[PDB]
């Protein structure tokens, strides 16, 4: 906190997705790669925005510490953030939940519904007994 500064570059606005894009480089002189949450809240203060719509990722620390380069995403509204953003970043910030099953079971369910024809009661009942 004492010596951590945030710089931005390649900044450009695109209302195509109602966002402004930039690549940011942090300066943690003797500190670990600064956590994304601190960058989010500092980058929000630089741009005067609430620290729940700022999106940052792709943080690579240079050899020997100091500079770490990352990609910055900001939006004019959280509504738009839910609209056009990859789901992992929304899940990273907790606004999207992927409480699903593994892909291997989904394929087995699909094949097992292929064996049963038409009958909705058995088509929805194909995966009950073989749990």
């Amino acid at each position: 906190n004492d010596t951590v500064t945030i710089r931005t570059r390649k900044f450009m606005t695109n209302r195509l997705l109602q966002r402004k894009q930039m690549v940011i480089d942090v300066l943690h002189p003797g500190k670990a790669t600064v956590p994304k949450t601190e960058i989010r809240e500092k980058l929000a203060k630089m741009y005067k925005t609430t620290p729940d719509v700022i999106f940052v990722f792709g943080f690579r620390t240079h050899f020997g510490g100091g500079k770490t380069t990352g990609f910055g995403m900001i939006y004019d509204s959280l509504d738009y953030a839910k609209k056009n953003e990859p789901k992992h970043r929304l899940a990273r910030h907790g606004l999207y939940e992927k409480k699903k099953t593994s892909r291997k079971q989904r394929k087995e369910r699909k094949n097992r519904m292929k064996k049963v024809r038409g009958t909705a009661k058995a088509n929805v009942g194909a995966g009950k007994k073989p749990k």
Binding site: P29, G30, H62, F63, G64, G65, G66
Partner: protein, 185 residues
């Protein structure tokens, strides 16, 4: 299928004949003088010079005023004076054939830090560089074979984190210090 690259090349060539008393001593002179690990890296720089000599020789047989000879002529001369093995005023294709491997070896970071006086010996230099102590510009470098350019030659200095520039001494100093204060009131 896969999106790999598999574009690789060897950086050295082994000698045709093994066990020459003349060649073995000549390479061992260079290895000891410049503090090299093995004979592969004296073969590597030799291979680098041979590639430069081959490229320079081809341009010389090429007719004068040929655009390729002119364009690539100053292209390889430009980078030869940038790294520093070639004199600024020695900008002729003939003078490239007169280059040796000693100049290509003294441009190494291990050699320059010794010559800059940062290191007490050429062999101290290798272990100092490998121990993440020296830096070029604002970047710490831990590779002895880092060739330096004329611009980067001045900037070579100790890294801030090392116990030679900024503070934060090594663990052995701290353990010695904590043992000293633990042995008395």
């Amino acid at each position: 299928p896969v999106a790999r690259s598999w574009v690789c090349r060897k950086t050295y060539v082994t000698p045709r004949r093994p066990f020459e008393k003349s060649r073995l001593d000549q390479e061992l002179k260079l290895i000891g003088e410049y503090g090299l690990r093995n004979k592969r890296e004296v073969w590597r720089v030799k291979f680098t010079l041979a590639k430069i000599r081959k490229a320079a020789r081809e341009l010389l047989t090429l007719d004068e005023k040929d655009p390729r000879r002119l364009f690539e002529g100053n292209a390889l001369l430009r980078r030869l004076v940038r790294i520093g093995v070639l004199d600024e005023g020695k900008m002729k294709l003939d003078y490239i054939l007169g280059l040796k491997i000693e100049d290509f070896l003294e441009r190494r970071l291990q050699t320059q830090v010794f010559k800059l006086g940062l290191a007490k010996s050429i062999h101290h230099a290798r272990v100092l560089i490998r121990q993440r102590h020296i830096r070029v510009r604002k970047q710490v470098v831990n590779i002895p074979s880092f060739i330096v350019r004329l611009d980067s030659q001045k900037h070579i200095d100790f890294s801030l984190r090392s116990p030679y520039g900024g503070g934060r001494p090594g663990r052995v100093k701290r353990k010695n210090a904590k043992k000293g204060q633990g042995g008395a009131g």
